[PDB]
Amino acid sequence: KYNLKMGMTAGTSQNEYKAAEVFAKELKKRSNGEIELKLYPNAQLGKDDLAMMQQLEGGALDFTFAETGRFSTFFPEAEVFTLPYMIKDFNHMKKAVNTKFGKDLFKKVHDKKGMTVLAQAYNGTRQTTSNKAIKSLADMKGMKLRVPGAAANLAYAKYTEAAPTPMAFSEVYLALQTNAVDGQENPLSTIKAQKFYEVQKYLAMTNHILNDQLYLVSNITMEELPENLQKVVKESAEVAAEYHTKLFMDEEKSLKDFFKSKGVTITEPNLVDFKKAMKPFYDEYIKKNGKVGENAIKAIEAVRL
Ligand SMILES: CC(=O)N[C@H]1[C@H]([C@H](O)[C@H](O)CO)O[C@](O)(C(=O)O)C[C@@H]1O
């Protein structure tokens, strides 16, 4: 019997965990009990996604979650997948990772980082919450905006003239409650699941970064499994990914109504000022990655539709 482990930053209330439960359910079903997957949420295995991805390389951890743009830590050119206002929708994201650039990235992740991408899911589009109303770009000036330890999110806070305040995901609620920070930044689904709306009187539809979610498996783990069970793992992830995608999609259809009923004021500021403010980070990306970065942008821009 194969007792596998899956770690994640998301809590048990979030859609990521719900889809992971389906993943474990499919694994046990399609393997006739040979494969049993235990879930380890709330980042109880490591600091963040970066720590758990490193655990997959060593084979200590079998499965974990990761955004495609998060691979920029290992392959700098992959940051194009998480550049602010670069990805339009999930259909664009699906096609963006299926470019020659996207396919080469996953291939490099396999060859050099010991991780195999099983499936891709939609993990929501990020918005901005605050204790004060954000109706223009000037309203975010000097606010202590919490962001994850990622360059794209840090840049978004910086070029909106906010004060980038990086901290762990588990420490966000308390920080908002005690007004240590003035606001955070996450998809609507995450905002509801982690109940950030309980401590945030405002919500700005900024739509700056789209998050996908990759079902990663350790290369060592796949090597320890019979070939037919490796196919089970692949198929189980694809099933969960669809369920994963549908969860975020369904909520984003009616979550704005939910928040407004809870007394949260939802603003929809003009985003052409937001998009224009992100230009120096694009220059930053290009200067760091050179022609590789330029061609990557033009390749992903082409499949936006
Ligand atoms: C797979 C994964 O760990 N996603 C996490 C992301 C990424 O760490 C970040 O976007 C960088 O890619 O940040 C969070 O949204 C956050 O801290 O607010 C939590 C979320 O669980």
SS3 114: coil
259 and 196 Cβ atoms separated by less than 8 Å: no
Determine whether 172 is exposed, middle or buried from the number of CB atoms within 10 Å of its CB (0-12, 13-18, 19+).
Answer: buried
192 and 261 Cβ atoms separated by less than 8 Å: no
Q: Please report the sign of the dihedral spanned by the C-alpha atoms of residue 153, residue 147, residue 114, residue 112.
A: positive
How many whole angstroms separate alpha carbon 241 and alpha carbon 118?
9
* CATH fold for the domain made of 1-305: D-Maltodextrin-Binding Protein; domain 2 (3.40.190)
Is 186 annotated as contributing to ligand binding? yes
Question: Which residues, at least 6 apart from 32, have a Cβ–Cβ distance to it below 8 Å?
Answer: none
Per-domain residue ranges for the chain?
Answer: 1-305
* Planar angle of CA 246, 18, 239, nearest 5 degrees: 55
How many whole angstroms separate alpha carbon 28 and alpha carbon 207?
37
169 and 9 Cβ atoms separated by less than 8 Å: yes
Instruction: Give me the amino acid identity at 219.
Output: N
How many whole angstroms separate alpha carbon 94 and alpha carbon 117?
13
How many whole angstroms separate alpha carbon 221 and alpha carbon 56?
8
Q: What is the dihedral of CA 6, 11, 12, 13, to 10 degrees?
A: -150
165 and 146 Cβ atoms separated by less than 8 Å: yes
**Given resolution (angstroms):** 2.5
249 token code pair: 């999609």
β-sheet bridge partners, residue 164:
145
**Way the structure was solved:** X-ray
Atom 13 of ligand 1, nearest CA residue: 148
Q: Is 263 left (phi over 0), alpha (psi -120 to 50) or beta?
A: left
SS3 265: strand
How many whole angstroms separate alpha carbon 120 and alpha carbon 66?
10
Give the residue, out of 13, 48, 73, with the most ligand 1 atoms within 8 A of its beta carbon, to mutate for a pocket test. Answer: 48
Gap from CA of 220 to ligand 1 centroid (Å): 25
Which atom of ligand 1 lies nearest, measured to the CA of 147?
Answer: 18
49 token code pair: 């996604």
How many whole angstroms separate alpha carbon 273 and alpha carbon 72?
26
How many whole angstroms separate alpha carbon 119 and alpha carbon 239?
9
